[PDB]
Amino acid sequence: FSSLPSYAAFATAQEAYEQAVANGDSEVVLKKLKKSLNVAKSEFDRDAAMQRKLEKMADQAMTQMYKQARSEDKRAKVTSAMQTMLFTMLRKLDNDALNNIINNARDGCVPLNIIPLTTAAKLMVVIPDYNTYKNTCDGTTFTYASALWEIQQVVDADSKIVQLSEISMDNSPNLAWPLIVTALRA
């Protein structure tokens, strides 16, 4: 706008017009100078609108570039998080039993629903009432999934540890069922 020579042309035309008006020149010269100033300011406004459009387009392009940069930086963060999760879950795997069962497969393909059932080293049992507790995992060891599990901890709905001696028919109302008994394979 101001940097362009159109503004300089407008300024010099206005200065000439003011000097002529203060000098009281002839009316025809006044009209000629008014026409010159009009075309000068016409070119000025013609050039200015392009500047406004150009600066708005540059601003929206800068906003778009910032948005894309932020999205690209978020993609890398989510990729790193997913990789760390996948490799941590991999490292948590029980390699010996998993390899045994997968090799025993005829085609190398096994259903997912038997991977925990035959290779998990920890069992969590959620028990809603006392009769269920008596029937499924009474005592300190019990049988499930064709294995032998031993109790290592019993916690209630509050995740507050419960001793095995507190789980009685008369003390049942004083417990926060369900109890999440965590067992380990023997």
Partner: protein
């Protein structure tokens, strides 16, 4: 004398008989023939009058379940049936006949005597279960009692027939499983005997008593021996819904198929039961002449996926439930051993293997990282084994080391609005407008006790011959839309600040994944799902919303890996449905600017004697059978006749099943297996539900038309239509487009319908529905009973005989006819309790301020405007209460703003929100 007749009927067999008739005359009974001849067709309850029935009594003179049917007919039929029986005499599955000629009065009237039949036939059981009316169920009760399924006092329970209130009825029915299975075996023996004896004939249910013996040879023609053919299309197909209801094949889990011997211990590693399925099919459905592919990946089209999947539904109940689900395989990436899912074993679609399995890789692209972190193979393989005794559903693994018990908070009370309301005369004792909608709180056992409701989803084998025609009628209903695959750049997502499912919600909303993945690797993922199966976990989120009943509501958040591809696959069709006006499926039709009136006028499309009807689906999203969900997915996929190949469409269907129908469900930090039923969070949920609703309605019409007598149908066009409908169902294997169009036009003329995914208003013809030529409420009750395993109590189903009052309730909006301008229009008005409860109870503390939320009350008053024209003043006062409260909120907001500054707002256009005209403009058809 009538005594010589009894002595002759006794015959050489030492049988002691007591005549059920009266004086050597035919006994009249009301049986349930499956008949098709030149003048009548259908599976209806007729009145046979050609058989003299004598009942045999055992020792101590107790009447037992054995009858001597002494059918008499012409002489030529006598000779013909005697010859056909002589051919089939030695087959063990044939009731011992007795052909003699007894002088009834003065002439030799020839009788054939069937010896030791049961009272009812197989057709009576099939009809009593497929046409269940709890007000008149006397053959079902007698069949259940006479075969020791119950003790004749079991029916003194209030609702002994209800599946969702009395789940012991499943055991009571399953006590008939062994008898039904023995009937199937006897049918196969009889088919083999017909084949070897050179006899051509049709096998109908009403000719096999409940023991299994066959006794009707009237219409059997004999051809060259060794080349007879049994026509069993209508025998097996009608019997199909009874095979899973009674669990006829529960004796196949036992070694040597003996109900006393212990279960078969299949090796856990075994997942490919194709040979077992083939052996079962060749043992029970031997002469079912259409080819059966155990693995539906080999199928020919979606008409062959339905049939083979329907069989796989029945055959999957005898295989261990731990052999299904994803099939994992140990792949290596840069030498590190992954365990990933490279297949699936559907209960309906058989074994499906992925085609792009990379055993040795080095880098994981973002697409592959998403796929491997989406499927539950890693999460279940690295999680602790779980045994959740709170639910009967299968539990896979516990991801964390302790279970999460998620609660639901109570609502936040807007005391200012309540004080304002009671200052306006509201909430008095004895008033008609009272609070019924609240924010109900839930304990830690809410999410799991709500997930446990999937136990109402039972394996249902559908009537495949009838279903394969209902599908044609439904696809005719969906013939005005267009669909197909679109590029990732054409997919528009409404709200991207929404949860991404599990496990992706640990790192961002759906916006992060829709931004990170360029269009190229969204198209790559979509084209991956067309050649591979991606299992996916779906969370269960407790819904924090206001309702009138204290049951916990849960919604399933499907993973972004499933949502993106399902959007890209179905969005064109879904946006085509939402932009169509005046169709059957009114989705995307607003109720403002005259939308409700337009919808109601299009429902009354030139019906003759209209009565409005509406029904309810109890446990709709949980009791929906897997077969009907697969049918809905196939119907929505018929628009892909050019974009997708055959294998592409099958793998899209397999992904839909493995991600929505039966996938791993994350409920409180633990992976459970969803038995079936639609999840309420998949991409095409409302539209699939609309397809299922139309399917149920069309099935109800089909059953209503076929179950009518046929001798009572006066209109020669309707009787012919019933005849050709039976022909198109059970006598024609290819599609007949002419009759499909004719039946579609018939339904549109007499059963005009309006569907929004489970809310339906029907404007049927009252005269036809009374005469039985169109579905009524009772037909929907029967269809739901045998095809959803739920009982539809007639308390939630309404009927409106007067159209000046509109539908009683559609989309929770009652309809009233008001004078607007110079004419009469229908306006939808809500339940006032709902609007007042929305005003008083809010789900956030910042919505209790009031002055911050004036748009809330503007929207609520927009919804509550049509109450102004209600005749009940306590209803009309809700709108004025909201207007006056908006005025008070604006006044105190201006006061607070004037305090917080020293200048009032220069521009204030809030003065139009407490004038009735701004809201009256919302129901005027100009826009």
């Amino acid at each position: 004398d009538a005594q010589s007749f009894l002595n002759r009927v006794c015959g050489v067999s030492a049988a002691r008989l007591t005549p059920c008739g009266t004086g050597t005359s035919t006994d009249v009974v009301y049986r349930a023939f499956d008949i098709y001849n030149d003048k009548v067709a259908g599976f209806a309850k007729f009145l046979k009058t050609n058989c003299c029935r004598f009942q045999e009594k055992d020792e101590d003179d107790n009447l037992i379940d054995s009858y001597f049917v002494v059918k008499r007919h012409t002489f030529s039929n006598y000779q013909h049936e005697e010859t056909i029986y002589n051919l089939l005499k030695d087959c063990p599955a044939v009731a011992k006949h007795d052909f003699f000629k007894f002088r009834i009065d003065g002439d030799m009237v020839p009788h054939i005597s069937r010896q030791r039949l049961t009272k009812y036939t197989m057709a009576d059981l099939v009809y009593a279960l497929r046409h269940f009316d709890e007000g008149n169920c006397d053959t079902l009760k007698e069949i259940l009692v006479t075969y020791n399924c119950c003790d004749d006092d079991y029916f003194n329970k209030k609702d002994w027939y209800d599946f969702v209130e009395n789940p012991d009825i499943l055991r009571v029915y399953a006590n008939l499983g062994e008898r039904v299975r023995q009937a199937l075996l006897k049918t196969v023996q009889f088919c083999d005997a017909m084949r070897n004896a050179g006899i051509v004939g049709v096998l109908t249910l009403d000719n096999q008593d409940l023991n299994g013996n066959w006794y009707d040879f009237g219409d059997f023609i004999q051809t060259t021996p060794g080349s007879g053919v049994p026509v069993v299309d209508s025998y097996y197909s009608l019997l199909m819904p009874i095979l899973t209801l009674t669990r006829a094949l529960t004796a196949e889990s036992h070694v040597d198929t003996d109900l006393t011997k212990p279960y078969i211990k299949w090796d856990l590693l075994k997942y490919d039961f194709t040979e077992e399925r083939l052996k079962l099919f060749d043992r029970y459905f031997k002469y079912w002449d259409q080819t059966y592919h155990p693995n539906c990946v080999n199928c020919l089209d979606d008409r062959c996926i339905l049939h083979c999947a329907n069989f796989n539904v029945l055959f999957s109940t005898v295989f261990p439930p731990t052999s299904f689900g994803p099939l994992v395989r140990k792949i290596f990436v840069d030498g590190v051993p992954f365990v990933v899912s490279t297949g699936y074993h559907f209960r309906e679609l058989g074994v499906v293997h992925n085609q792009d399995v990379n055993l040795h890789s080095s880098r994981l692209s973002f697409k592959e990282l998403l796929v491997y972190a989406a499927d539950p193979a890693m999460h279940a393989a690295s999680g602790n084994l779980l045994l959740d005794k709170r639910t009967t559903c299968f539990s896979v693994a516990a991801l964390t080391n302790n279970v999460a018990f998620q609660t639901v908070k109570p609502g936040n009370f807007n005391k200012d609005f309540y004080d304002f309301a009671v200052s306006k005369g509201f909430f008095k004792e004895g008033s008609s407008v009272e609070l019924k909608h609240f924010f109900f709180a839930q304990d830690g056992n809410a999410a799991i006790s709500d997930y446990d409701y999937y136990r109402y989803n039972l394996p249902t084998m559908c009537d495949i011959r009838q279903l394969l025609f209902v599908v044609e009628v439904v696809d005719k209903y969906f013939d005005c839309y267009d669909g197909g695959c679109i590029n990732a750049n054409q997919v528009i997502v409404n709200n991207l600040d929404k949860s991404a499912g599990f496990p992706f919600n640990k790192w961002g909303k759906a916006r992060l994944y829709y931004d990170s993945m360029s269009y190229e690797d969204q198209d790559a993922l979509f084209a991956y799902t067309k050649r591979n199966v991606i299992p996916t976990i779906t969370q269960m989120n407790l819904k924090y919303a206001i309702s009138a009943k204290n049951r916990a509501r849960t919604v399933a958040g499907v993973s972004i890996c499933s949502t993106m591809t399902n959007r890209q696959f179905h969005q064109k069709l879904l946006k085509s449905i939402a932009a169509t006006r005046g169709a059957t499926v009114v989705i995307g039709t607003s109720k403002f600017y005259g939308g409700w009136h337009n919808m109601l006028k299009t429902v009354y499309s030139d019906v003759e004697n209209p009565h409005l009807m509406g029904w309810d689906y109890p446990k709709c999203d949980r009791a929906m059978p897997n077969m009907l969900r697969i049918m809905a997915s196939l119907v929505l996929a018929r628009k892909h006749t050019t974009c997708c190949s055959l294998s592409h469409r099958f793998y899209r269907l397999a992904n839909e099943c493995a991600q929505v129908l039966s996938e791993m469900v994350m409920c409180g930090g633990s992976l459970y297996v969803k038995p079936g039923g639609t999840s309420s969070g998949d991409a095409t949920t409302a539209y699939a539900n609309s397809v299922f609703n139309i399917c149920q309605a069309v099935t109800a019409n089909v059953n209503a038309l076929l179950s009518t007598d046929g001798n009572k149908i006066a209109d020669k066009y309707v009787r012919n239509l019933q005849h050709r409908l039976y022909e198109c169902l059970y006598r024609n294997r290819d599609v007949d487009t002419d009759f499909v169009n004719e039946f579609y036009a018939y339904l549109r003329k007499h059963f005009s319908m309006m569907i929004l995914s489970d809310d339906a208003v029907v404007c049927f013809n009252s005269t036809y529905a009374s005469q039985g030529l169109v579905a009524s409420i009772k037909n929907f009750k029967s269809v739901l009973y045998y095809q959803n395993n739920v009982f539809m109590s007639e308390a939630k189903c309404w009927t409106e005989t007067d159209l000046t009052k509109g539908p009683h309730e559609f989309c929770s909006q009652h309809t009233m006819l008001v004078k607007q301008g110079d004419d009469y229009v229908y306006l939808p008005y809500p339940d006032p309790s709902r609007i007042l409860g929305a005003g008083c109870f809010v789900d956030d503390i910042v919505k209790t301020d009031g002055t911050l939320m004036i748009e809330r009350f503007v929207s609520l008053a927009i919804d509550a405007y049509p109450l102004t024209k209600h005749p009940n003043q306590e209803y009309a006062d809700v709108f004025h209460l909201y207007l006056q409260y908006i005025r008070k909120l604006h006044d105190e907001l201006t006061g607070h703003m004037l305090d917080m500054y020293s200048v009032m707002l220069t521009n204030d256009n809030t003065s139009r929100y407490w004038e009735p005209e701004f809201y009256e403009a919302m129901y005027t058809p100009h826009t």
